Amino acid sequence: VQFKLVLVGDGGTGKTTFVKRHLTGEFEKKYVATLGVEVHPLVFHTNRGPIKFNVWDTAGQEKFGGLRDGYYIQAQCAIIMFDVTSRVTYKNVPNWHRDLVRVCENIPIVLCGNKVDIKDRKVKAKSIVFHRKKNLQYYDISAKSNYNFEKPFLWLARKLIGDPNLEFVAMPALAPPEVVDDPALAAQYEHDLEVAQTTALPDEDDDL
Amino acid sequence: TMEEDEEVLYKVRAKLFRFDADAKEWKERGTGDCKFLKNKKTNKVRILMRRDKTLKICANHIIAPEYTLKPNVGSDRSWVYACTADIAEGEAEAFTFAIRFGSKENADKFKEEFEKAQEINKK
Amino acid sequence: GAMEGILDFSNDLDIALLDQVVSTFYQGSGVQQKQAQEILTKFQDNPDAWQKADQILQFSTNPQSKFIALSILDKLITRKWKLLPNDHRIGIRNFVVGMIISMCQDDEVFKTQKNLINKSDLTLVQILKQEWPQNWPEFIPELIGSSSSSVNVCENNMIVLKLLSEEVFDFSAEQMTQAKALHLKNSMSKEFEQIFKLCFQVLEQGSSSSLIVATLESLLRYLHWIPYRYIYETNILELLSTKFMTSPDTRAITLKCLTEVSNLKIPQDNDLIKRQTVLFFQNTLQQIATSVMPVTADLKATYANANGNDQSFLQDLAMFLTTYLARNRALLESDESLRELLLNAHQYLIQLSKIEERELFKTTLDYWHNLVADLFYEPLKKHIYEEICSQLRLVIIENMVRPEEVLVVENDEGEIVREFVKESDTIQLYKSEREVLVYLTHLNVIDTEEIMISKLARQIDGSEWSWHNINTLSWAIGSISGTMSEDTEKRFVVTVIKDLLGLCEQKRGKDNKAVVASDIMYVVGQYPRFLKAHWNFLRTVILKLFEFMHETHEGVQDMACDTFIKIVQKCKYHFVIQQPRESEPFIQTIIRDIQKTTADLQPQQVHTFYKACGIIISEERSVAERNRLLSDLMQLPNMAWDTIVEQSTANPTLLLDSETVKIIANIIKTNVAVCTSMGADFYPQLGHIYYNMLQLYRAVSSMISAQVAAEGLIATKTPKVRGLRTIKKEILKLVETYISKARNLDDVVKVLVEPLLNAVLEDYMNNVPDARDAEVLNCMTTVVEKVGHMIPQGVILILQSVFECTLDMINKDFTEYPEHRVEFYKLLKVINEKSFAAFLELPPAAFKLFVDAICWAFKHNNRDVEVNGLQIALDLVKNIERMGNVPFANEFHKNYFFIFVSETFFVLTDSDHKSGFSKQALLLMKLISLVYDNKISVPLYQEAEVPQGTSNQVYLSQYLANMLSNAFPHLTSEQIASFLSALTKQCKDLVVFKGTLRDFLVQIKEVGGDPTDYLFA
C-alpha cells in the first residue's frame, strides 16, 4: 500500500529538513540544497494498516531544479512548502501550484507554512488564503519545534485511504535481544566513547 | 502495541540522540516518553521510547548489566552510553546514545532507575 | 553501467535504452532509481539534447520519455528560441502541432495519455509566446476551425486556450517584460470575439461532456479579464446558473465560474444588470436546494463523512456565497420578494460555519466580520438579520478557541498540562472570533448576555459540565470586554466571577481545579475597568491570584503571574494609594509578604512577580516615596547581593560554586525584571549595585578565560562556563535595559559609560572568538543610540574594540556566529547614523574593511543582516553627499562609487537575493541620481581613460555598458544601451525604475529580448 508524494517549494523553505525529521527524528541545521530530487520511503502505522509514502523531495532552487515538473508525473498527493519568515516564498506558492496541478490535475495537496517557531514572522496568518479557492489543506508547521509536523501526512492518509476516522497508532514493539555483546570488550570502546562524551549535545538551552 | 504483557517501572520525558561518528556530531532520534518496561513473564526490563504524535519507536533495547551511563561535557542533565542491540528501526544495531531530560533531578532519577533495572536483569 | 550510454552524443541515441532509464527512474527504487535520475538530468541538461526530441517523440514507447523530450524543447523555446534559424523554428512548430493533432485523433491515446497531451499543449503555448501573433497571425482562426472536424481536437483546443490565457493574464507579471505582457494581452483581446463564439456554441449544445468541462475550465480563466458584456449580454449566466449546476460533473467548475462572476464590480447604475446579478444567484441557490441538499441539511456531518467531492463542494459553496454576498447582498435587502433568498443564502452559511474544519471556518468567519461590521454602521439593516445573528452568536460562543493568555491545555492522553508551544494560528483565530463576537454583542447585547448567562447556569448545575464547555464559555465571556455598560458589566461580571469561584470550590482534582482556575484568570484579566471601580473585588482577585501561585500545577502558577502583570498594568493606581477601610496601601502589603507569596514559584516566575511590583511602584510619582518603595522591593535580592559581594571578594574562588553562580544570575535577573518595568526610575537601585556588578563582570570574565586556557574551547560548552557567561549576559542586559529608557543622559555619560567600556570592551577584543558574547555588541548599540552624540571618543573606542575582530569572525561564511552577525550590523548601522564622524577617523585600510563589510551584508540571505546592510549603504551615501565638495568625499567616490554600483547590480541580478529587491533598487537609484544630478565633484575616471572634460554621466553609462556586456554576453549591445538609457532617465521615479529592472531580469533569462521594451514608460 504505497503512494507517491511530491514535495515542492522555494529553496531553503525546509522541505528536506521536514522529511529528515520524519525519516530519522533528526533536525538538520545546515542548508544543503537538494540537487534535482531525492526519493525517500516513509511508513506510518494506522488503525487501517501501514501506509507508505514514497516522498519525492524536489529541489527549490532554479539552478538545481533538474527535471522540474517531470518529477510530478503520476504523483498521488503533494505538499507545497513555504517559509513564513520569507514573503517571497509565499508569493511563489501560486507558481509551484500552477506547475504541479498542470501535471497532477486531481490529487490531494497540503499547503504548509514552515518555521512558525521564529518569532519575527513575516507571512502572517491572515495573509495566507491561497489554499481556499484551490481546495488545498493548510497547516502552520515547524520542523524545528515539530508543531503540526504530523498533520500533512495524517490528512493525506485520510484522503488516500478514503477514511476520515483514520488515526496513527503505536507501532508494535517486539522484545529486544537479551544476550548482547559487552561494549567494553570492543577495544575501540574507550576511544569511541570519549569522542561521544567530549562532543557537546546541541541546543543545551532547549527545554529537552 | 506488544506492551500489554509489561509493567511500567519508570516513565520520564526525554530527548534521545545517537552519535554519528562519520560527522562527529549528535543527531536527535526522538522526543517523548522514555519507559522502563518489565516483562511480567521473564522479568526482563527494557527501555522503550516512542516519539510524540507519530508514536514511532526511537529506542527499544534491554537495559543490559554491561552498560554504563557516562556524563556529557556539555550537560548536567544527560547520560551517554554504548548500546549493542537496539531494534527500534529493525535489525539489531549498536549505537552510542545520549539521552537528555528536563532537569538534573530527572537525570539523576533516570540513572538510579537504570541501575535498579540492571540489577533486575542480572537474575 | 549501460544506462550512461544515452549521454554519449557521438553515437545515435538508443531510444530503447532511454526508455529503460526513464522506466528505472519513475518505476524503480533505491540505487538504480538514483543513478537513472542523475543520468536523465545530465541528458536533459545537454545543450544539444533538443535535437533528439523529434526522434524521441516519434520512436519512444514510453510516455514519460516523451514528456521529458518536451521539457527539453520547453527549455529551448523559453530561453534560446531566437538563435535558431527560421526554418528550424517553423520545423519545431510543425511537429509539435502535428503530434498534438495526431494524439487527439487517436481515441485511445486521447483517453490514456492526458499527461503527455497536456504537456504538449503547454509546449505549444510557449511557442505562441515567442511567435504569436506577429509570426503566426492565423493561429486563432486555424484553431477555431480545426475544432469543428473533431470532438477531441475541439476539447483539447479548450485546453490550449485555457493555458494561453493563464500564461498571458495570470502569470505574465513576473515572466515577461511589461511591453511583451501588454502585447500579448492586446493580441488575445483583439481575437476574443471569435474565441467566445466557439466557447458559447459548445456550451449551448451539450450537458455533461468532457468537452463541456474543458470549455468551462477555459471560461473560468477568461472571467479574470474579459469585458462584462460577454457575461451579461449573452445567455451564459442562465446556462451556468441552471443547466450546468444540475449535473455533478459540471457543477464544481460552474460554481467556480459563478464565483468569478460574483466578484466583478458591476456598473451600479444599471437596473437590468442588477436584475441579472440577482437572477443567477436565485437560480444557483434553487439548484442547490433541489439537487444537492436543503437548507436544513447537517453540513457538519456531511463534511465529516467526506464522501466523494463533498468537502471540495462545500468549500466552493462557502467561497461562492461569501464572495457574492459581500459584493451584492444589498441587491437582495430592499425587495421583499428577495428576502427569503437573502436569508436562505445566509442560513447555508450558518450551516457551513458549523463544519469542523479550521480553514473553512476562517473563510466563513471572514464573511461574518464583513456582515456584522456593516450591520454595526449601516442604518436600518440589522433587523433583517436578527435570526441569522442570534444563530451566529451560538456558533461562535460554542467554538471559541484558546486565547494566548491561557497557559493550561489538554494533551493527547487527557491530562491538563502547561502548553508546550505558543500557537500563532489559533491565537489569530481567537482574535478573529473576538472581533465578530464584539460586533454581535453590540448588535444585541441582551441576546448575548442571555446566551452566556444560561450557559453558565448549566455549568454550575452540572447538566452541561465539561472542560470544553466551561472553556469556550469563559473565553467568550472574556472576549466581549468593553461591549457592555459598566452597570450591566457590573452585574454581569459580578455574576460570572462569583459563579466561577463557586465552580472552583466544588471541583475535585488537580485537573478540574487548573481548568477552572485558568478560566477565572482569563476572565478577570480581561475586565480591568470593573476591577478598578470595585476594590473589594480587585483585592480578592489579587489575593486569589496569590493563592494560585501556590498550586502544584506550573501552568496555573505561570498564569497567575501573567494575570497579575496584566491586571496591574491597568489597575496599578489602586495599589499605590491607601484605600478607605485599609491600614496601608496594598503595594506595601504585597512587598512585605513577597517571600511568602513567591515561595513556591520558580525563579523566572519570581522575576515576573517583581516586574509587576515594579509597575505598581512606578505609579508613584513622588520621587522620595518611590525610591523607598524601590528600596523596599529590592530588599531580598539586595541582601543576597550584599552577602555575595563580601564573600566573593574575600576569596575570588567562591564563584566556582555552581549554586553561587545560579544565585548571582537570579539576583541580576531580578534587577533586569524590575528595571524593565521601571525604566528611568530604576536608577537608584542600579546605583546601589553598579560598581560591584562591574567588578563581578571582571572577576567572572577572568574565570572564563582561565577555564578556556586550561580545558580548551570545549570549556565554553560546560555548564560551569555557560553559567558564568549568563552572569555576563544578564549584566549587559541590565545596563542595556536601563540606558534604553534613561532620561538623565548626563548621568549615563558621566557615571555609567566610562566604567562600562573599561569593563567590557577589552575583555571582548582580547577573548578568543568562541568566548565573545554577542550581547556586548547589543549593549553598545543602545549606548551609541542613546548618548552617542555626547561621547564621540567613546564611539571611536567602541569601533576599535569590536569592528575588525568581529568582522573576522563573520567573513569566512554566512553561517558562523549568527548572533554576532546580526548585532554587528545593528551596531554599524547606529554608528553610521548617529556618529558618522567615528568612521572618518578610521585609517584608510579600516575604512576599506567597512565598505567590504557593507557589501558582504548585501550578499546575505538572512533578512536581518541584508536589510541593515542595504540601509547602511544608503545612509553612508547620504553621509558622504552631505559633506559636499571636500577631499574625503571626492576620495570616497573615486575609491568606492563603482564598487557600490557593481555590488548592488550583482545582488540585483543573481536571482539569489530577491527578498531585498526594493532596497537594492532604491540604493541603485540613489547612486545613479548622484551622477545625473552632478553631485560628484571630481571625475570618476582616471586621467587617460577618456577625453578630459568628459562628464561623469557619459563615463557612468560606458562603465555600466562594459560591465553588463561582460557579465551578460548573450545580450546585444542595443539591449544594454536601451536598458541603461531607460534606467538613467527613470532615476527619480522608483516604481518605474523598479519596473525597468524587472524587465531587465526577464531579458537576461533569454536570448533576443526586444530593446524597445525599455520604452514602456
Ligand SMILES: Nc1nc2c(ncn2[C@@H]2O[C@H](COP(=O)(O)OP(=O)(O)OP(=O)(O)O)[C@@H](O)[C@H]2O)c(=O)[nH]1
Ligand atoms: N527555525 C527553523 N528553521 C528551519 C525549520 N525548518 C528548516 N529550517 C532550516 O532552514 C533550512 C532549510 O533547509 P532545507 O530543508 O535544506 O531546504 P529545502 O527546502 O530542502 O531547500 P532545497 O532543497 O534547496 O529546495 C535549514 O538550514 C534548516 O535547518 C524550522 O521549522 N524552523
Ligand SMILES: [Cl-]
Ligand atoms: Cl501570525
Ligand SMILES: [Cl-]
Ligand atoms: Cl506522461
Ligand SMILES: [Cl-]
Ligand atoms: Cl458581446
Ligand SMILES: [Cl-]
Ligand atoms: Cl491605574
Ligand SMILES: [Cl-]
Ligand atoms: Cl568588495
Ligand SMILES: [Cl-]
Ligand atoms: Cl546590437
Ligand SMILES: [Mg+2]
Ligand atoms: Mg532540499
Ligand SMILES: [Mg+2]
Ligand atoms: Mg530474547
